[PDB]
Structure formats: structure tokens, C-alpha cells
Design a binder for this molecule. Structure first.
Ligand SMILES: NC(=O)C1=CN([C@@H]2O[C@H](COP(=O)(O)OP(=O)(O)OC[C@H]3O[C@@H](n4cnc5c(N)ncnc54)[C@H](OP(=O)(O)O)[C@@H]3O)[C@@H](O)[C@H]2O)C=CC1
Ligand SMILES: NC(=O)C1=CN([C@@H]2O[C@H](COP(=O)(O)OP(=O)(O)OC[C@H]3O[C@@H](n4cnc5c(N)ncnc54)[C@H](OP(=O)(O)O)[C@@H]3O)[C@@H](O)[C@H]2O)C=CC1
Ligand SMILES: Nc1nc2c(ncn2[C@@H]2O[C@H](COP(=O)(O)OP(=O)(O)O)[C@@H](O)[C@H]2O)c(=O)[nH]1
Ligand SMILES: Nc1nc2c(ncn2[C@@H]2O[C@H](COP(=O)(O)OP(=O)(O)O)[C@@H](O)[C@H]2O)c(=O)[nH]1
Lengths: 353, 354
């Protein structure tokens, strides 16, 4: 349905997901792709989004802009992670409607779901129970975004489509040890632990943008990482699914080509909980993932789990019957995704950290 | 009693039912630095206008009484509008109140935040614990997000953003538009116009509805199955809920602003979780009980009929008020007196919202 010459806007194109969607549409030869850096268009400025949408009137919108961070950043920035994401999504979704966009893809998150939802989690569990405390700010932004799509679809006849991915990983992520989500954090922690263990001082200098090992050792000691051990957060017991960034990009494009409002009414004629879960593969513990990374990248040191730090939800699995029956499948297995991310990590000179 | 007579006090939505009652009380009590703007003067849906206003006026206390709302049938149509307009108004006001170092803000919420199957009487801790009433979802989502935004600002920034969750309100200054009004003003206005028609008070009907002749008045009212013999209301009349008079809400808002701060909310929950305060007075009444009481008070001679072919929604709502009761708040106005005060105002007022 998206034509080669359709005006396609990718919001948050510099991010993990947005960069993968933009790269794929560029590779696949789409002719009319529009995007703006945060510097060029601040999506927290109501009038700037109004002006952009009125000038450009994109036919398709992939909403990939967000301000997020891992568990510890979420426990600090309670106001910021509600506020910034509420306004960005509300201005983009509203102006996409006011300027007669054909379809919009809203990216949501598993934190919409109740902590004690029956497993595997069904899309119909949204708003049926108490949230995970850690995630409440972002969860409330995402629930509100999901419901906003439903209400625009119902009142205005829009095609505002929601995909709810599991935790994502791959090239282009935020690997800042303090602010990263679990997968990029533990990958970056184990990788730096490996360079230290193997006395690869120059790679550590180049990777961390530091000049001497006193500064490297001091930076890494903050995370209880030394030449012998890499310490990770919590018990390592929480279990969840992971999905490779290029599979999410593929699913977003697939959904934008193939789903409309009329198809959502087959799930619920009032658009109630008509988002689609997006997941691939089994659940893994954080400890299993850590040990898999350690094997793949050849780390010889110890992985210790500092159980003095928080775990939240101990088990997440996702019902993916809606998107499976629509015909989507993942291409990238966890071992291959780790290898692709490692290959990229070894060569990228502008890593987010 | 911590707002001073000279405190800079902003009442957002000052022309509405709650806002007008708070402004009138503070004017009458001699507060000297009251700040307010009409919707025309300050559109709270414009981010930059809200920023400009807060930067200029730097209010110390904010009463957030602005909203775009409507009864059950308007809510079933305006799914997008009732989320969008309220989400952006509250987000801009709460954020700019933080950015401009307000002392305290009072956020008004609504019982639709609660699960349809919440255990009764409803406790504040039931918010986000279960499925909402479908009819109310758009406004309910705006209100849940507002309640949570006050919690998050309180936790991250040490603000004093305080939330009251009133039951259905009634009184002078309401929206009495027969199609868009909430249940209490709707049934009052329907019964009152039914009374005038039953009593052949054609001139009062022309004055009230701004129509020229009885044919026009009869066409308009026949939309609601109101005629010279009877008044038709929506549903079975069996749904039950609490009602609170507008001036009791105004008094509770002022009491809350004088008496609660963040330190006090932490006594309910150290992380501000579900630390809004329910606001209710009195027993649950059926819509039929309120309709019959209005009939009795205004002396309507006609029949009241409940059109069962229309929706009832949630069948019973009662509220746990232990928090606000332990703080020392009490309602002053009983239902019969509130109806009489509303009727007295209705028979005088030249600019009723209809
Ligand atoms: N990563 C994951 O594990 C998961 C992600 N998702 C969802 O996918 C979406 C994309 O996430 P992800 O790609 O990981 O996020 P990223 O942090 O990688 O990317 C965020 C993007 O938003 C941009 N942005 C942030 N603030 C603004 C602003 N004020 N104006 C304009 N642009 C802005 C960032 O640019 P800049 O950096 O220059 O500010 C960047 O382009 C989100 O909705 C997220 O919740 C869902 C499931 C899991
Ligand atoms: N009434 C009830 O039964 C209940 C009310 N509450 C809550 O109390 C609060 C006040 O409700 P209530 O007094 O009944 O509401 P009203 O509809 O009576 O008043 C709404 C006010 O907001 C103003 N307003 C609307 N849109 C804008 C805008 N874009 N910019 C600026 N001002 C605007 C209106 O002005 P104008 O008319 O000129 O547009 C008016 O001053 C709400 O949060 C409501 O949910 C809670 C419990 C029940
Ligand atoms: N952010 C992060 N989480 C980690 C790390 N090591 C383990 N975890 C665990 O992963 C979970 C947090 O995941 P994260 O992506 O931060 O947050 P979430 O997706 O919102 O749950 C917690 O159990 C942490 O204890 C790490 O280095 N960083
Ligand atoms: N709006 C309205 N509701 C009515 C009327 N008569 C009865 N009701 C009942 O009042 C309830 C709707 O209340 P309303 O204030 O519109 O919405 P809510 O407070 O969001 O539930 C339902 O139980 C209706 O059946 C009427 O004339 N108008």
C-alpha cells in the first residue's frame, strides 16, 4: 500500500528503531522519505510540530521518537518520562490527523500491561490491572498513546496502528552503562569487561573516548567492573523475550503496508485493545543472556549479579497470535543478532554511550 | 489556612461550574490577588499561551478547573476530543506550574478513573487496578494520566500537586444543554422545561430556550420525548450514585489547598502512589429518586418516564471518604437545599449554559 513515491515521515529517525526503518526504506528505494533531527524539529514544541505537519502533510508516519532509559533512570525521572513522551506523541498523532495522513504506526511497549497479567500476555489485558511500579511513568504515556489511537480511529476514521514490541536490541541502541536498557547495558558491560580482562587498553581508550587506564578503571569501578569480573544488576532471574531491531523495522513496514482500521475491527468492533503484540522466540533470563554474550564474544572473566539492585517483573511472555496470523515472522535468531551487534560494535565510531 | 489573603491565586476554568464557585467564594472572603482568564483570553490548549501566562503572572496557587466534558451520549461520540483536549490542557498547566515554582496546585479528577468492578465503597488505591467503564474511557484516561502526573512531579521535583476526586457535582453555573449535560443538570432542566410546558408558561419557555413560538419549543423538546403531559429521561432510572453540591466542592478545594501538602500525601503512600483524595458526601441515590425529588420540589404535575431503550452504564457507585473525613472536611448542603438553591438561581439567571 505504501507507494515508492508516498511521502513517508520517520519521527525519531536517529534512534534504534527509527534508524533501522529509515535504512531499510532507503535500501528498498523509496523516493520521498522525510525526517528531522531533534535539533531541526523539537517534537516537544507544539507549534514546531504543527508547522512541520502543515508544510509537509506526510501520507505515512512512523512514530519512533521517545525519551527513555533503563530501570534506574526510570526510578529517578518519574515526571520527565511521562511528560516528554505524552507531549511528543500527542502533537504528532493529532497533527497527523489534522493533515489527513493515510496511516500512522505508533510504537508502544510491554509496560502497558498489568504486572500480574496471565501469560502469555494478551492484547486484551491492557488496563485490566496494576502496573509494574518501576515503569509507571512510561507505561501511562504508552497506555494513553494506545488509547488515543483507538479514539481517533473511532471518532475520525483514522488508521492509527499500534505495535507493542518486547525489549529490542541491536546496532544503533543507547549503550550508556548508566541509562541503557538491560540488553545493550549487559552487552556493553561484558564487552568492556572483556577488553579490560585482555589488557586491550587502546580499544578501551577508543571505545570509551578516554586517554589512560586510571580513568578507564575509575569509570568501570562505578559498575563494579574490573580486569577479573563484570557485575550486572539484580539477581539475573527476570525472564523476558528479545527481538532484533531489524525484525522490528520489518514488522513496522509490514504493518504499515498490510493493516488498516477495518482489519482492527475484526479484533474488536469498537477498536478496544486493538494494538498488536510483537515478539519472537522464547523467554530468557537476564543471566542466560549474559552467559550467551560471554560465550559469543569470548569473555574469560566472571559475571556477578548484584542482587542488592532491583528486579521488577520476574516473567514476561507475549501472545503473538494476531501478528503471526497476519503473516509476519522474525528473521534473526538471538545468537545471530548478538553476532551482528558485536560485528557492528567492533567497527562503529559513533556509538551512543 | 496557609493561602494568605494577598497570595497570587490562579483559578483556571473560572467560568465553569466548579471554577465560578471557587472564584465567588474567594472574592467574597476578600482575597486580593485572584488571577483568571476566559477561554477567549487564554486557550489552555495552546502550549505557548500557557507558558506566556505562567511566566507573566507567576501564580503561587493554582486551582485547575478547566475541562471540556459532557454527559454519557456526548462521551460516546467525542472519543478523541475528550481525551485530547483535557490531556493537553492539564499537561501544560501542571508542567508550567512546576516550571514557575508554584507553591501548590489542586488538580480536579473524576470517579471515572476507577475500575467499573471496583469494590465498594471505592478506595483511592483501586485506581489502575481494573477495567474502566467503556463509556467514560477517553476522559478516564485523561484523568488517570493527570492523577499520575501529579504523583510523578511530587516524587521527582518535590511539588505539592494535590488531587481531589469528586462524585457527580450539581448546582448553579452548570451546563444544562439537554443533549450535552451530565445527568443531574440534564434531568433538572428536562423536568423544569416539562413543568413550564405542562403549565402553559409559553413566555417563560421563549425566555428560557431563546425560541419565538410554541411550535418551535414543542419541536425542540420532542427530541427528548418531553411534551405537555410528561418528561422522558434516559435509561431505567435504577443506576445509583452520590451527588455533591458545587459550593461544597468549592469549600473542599479551598480546604484542601489550605491544609494538604506533599508531606501529608506521603502518610498515605511514601512514593505518592494513589495519594489522590476522594470527595463525596451523603448516600447513593437512584436517578429515579433524584428525578422524583426534583418533581416534588419544583411542583411538576406531569409524568416522569425512564426510556429503558437508552444506556444505564455503571449501576452503583459509592465512594470511600475516610481520607478527607479524617482531615476534618464536612459538606454543608443537603440534597433538598442544593436543589432549591439551584432552582432559585435558575428562576433568576439570564445567561444559563444551555
Ligand atoms: N528499545 C526497546 O527496547 C523498545 C522500544 N520500543 C519503542 O520504540 C520506540 C523507539 O524506541 P528506541 O528506538 O529504542 O528509542 P531511541 O532512544 O533509540 O530513539 C529515540 C529517538 O527520539 C528522538 N527524540 C527524543 N526526544 C526528541 C525530541 N524532543 N524531538 C525530536 N526527536 C526526539 C531521539 O533523537 P535524539 O537522541 O537526538 O534526542 C531519537 O531519534 C519508542 O516508542 C519505544 O518505547 C518498544 C519496545 C521496546
Ligand atoms: N461537574 C461534575 O459533575 C464533575 C466535575 N469534576 C471535575 O471538575 C473540573 C471542572 O468541571 P466543571 O466545572 O463541571 O466544568 P465546566 O464544563 O463547568 O467548566 C469548564 C471550564 O473550562 C473552560 N475551558 C474549556 N476549554 C478550555 C480551553 N481550551 N481553554 C481554557 N479554558 C477552557 C470552560 O470555559 P468555556 O466554557 O468558556 O469554554 C470553563 O471555564 C473538571 O476537571 C471535571 O472533570 C469532577 C467530578 C464531577
Ligand atoms: N538497565 C539495566 N538493567 C539490568 C542490568 N543488568 C541487569 N538488569 C536487569 O534488567 C531489568 C531492567 O531492565 P531495563 O531494560 O532496565 O528496564 P525495563 O525494560 O523497563 O524493565 C532488571 O531486573 C535489572 O536488574 C543493567 O546493566 N542495566
Ligand atoms: N446525561 C444524562 N444522563 C442521564 C439522563 N437521564 C438518566 N441518565 C443516566 O445518568 C447516567 C449518565 O450520567 P452522565 O452524567 O451523563 O455520565 P457519567 O457521569 O460519565 O456516567 C446514566 O446512568 C444515564 O442512563 C439524562 O437526561 N442525561
Amino acid at each position: 500500500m505504501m507507494n515508492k513515491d508516498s511521502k513517508i515521515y520517520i519521527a525519531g529517525h536517529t534512534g534504534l528503531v527509527g534508524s533501522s526503518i529509515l535504512k531499510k526504506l532507503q535500501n528498498d528505494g523509496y523516493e520521498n522519505l522525510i525526517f528531522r533531527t531533534h535539533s531541526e524539529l523539537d517534537l516537544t514544541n507544539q507549534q514546531a510540530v504543527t508547522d512541520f505537519f502543515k508544510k509537509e502533510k506526510p501520507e505515512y508516519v512512523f512514530f519512533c521518537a521517545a525519551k527513555m532509559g533503563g530501570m534506574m533512570e526510570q526510578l529517578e525521572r518519574r515526571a520527565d518520562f511521562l511528560y516528554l513522551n505524552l507531549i511528543m506523541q500527542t502533537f504528532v498523532l493529532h497533527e497527523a490527523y489534522k493533515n489527513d495522513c493515510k496511516k500512522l504506526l505508533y510504537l508502544s511497549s510491554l509496560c502497558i500491561y498489568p504486572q500480574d497479567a496471565s501469560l502469555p500476555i494478551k492484547e486484551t489485558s491492557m488496563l485490566e490491572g496494576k502496573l509494574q511500579f518501576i515503569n509507571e511513568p512510561y507505561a501511562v504515556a504508552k497506555i494513553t498513546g494506545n488509547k488515543m489511537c483507538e479514539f481517533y480511529n473511532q471518532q475520525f476514521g483514522t488508521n492509527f496502528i499500534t505495535l507493542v514490541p518486547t525489549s529490542i536490541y541491536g546496532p544503533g541502541d543507547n549503550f550508556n552503562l548508566a541509562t541503557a536498557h538491560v540488553f545493550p547495558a549487559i552487552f556493553a558491560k561484558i564487552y568492556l569487561g572483556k577488553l579490560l580482562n585482555e589488557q586491550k587498553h587502546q580499544e578501551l581508550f577508543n571505545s570509551l573516548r578516554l586517554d589512560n587506564i586510571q580513568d578507564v578503571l575509575k569509570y568501570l569501578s562505578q559498575f563494579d567492573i574490573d580486569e577479573n569480573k563484570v557485575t550486572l544488576l539484580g539477581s539475573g532471574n527476570p525472564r523476558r523475550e528479545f527481538i532484533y531491531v531489524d525484525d522490528v523495522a520489518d514488522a513496522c513496514i509490514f504493518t504499515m503496508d498490510k493493516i488498516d482500521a477495518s482489519m482492527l475491527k475484526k479484533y474488536d468492533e469498537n477498536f478496544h485493545n486493538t494494538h498488536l503484540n510483537l515478539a519472537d522466540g522464547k523467554d530468557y533470563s537476564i543471566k542466560e543472556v549474559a552467559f550467551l554474550i560471554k560465550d559469543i564474544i569470548g569473555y574469560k572473566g566472571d559475571i556477578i549479579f548484584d542482587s542488592s539492585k532491583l528486579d521488577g517483573t520476574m516473567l514476561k511472555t507475549t501472545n503473538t497470535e494476531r501478528i503471526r496470523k497476519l503473516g509476519w515472522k522474525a528473521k534473526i535468531k538471538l545468537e545471530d543478532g548478538i553476532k551482528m551487534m558485536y560485528e557492528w560494535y567492533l567497527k562503529e565510531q559513533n556509538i551512543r554511550q
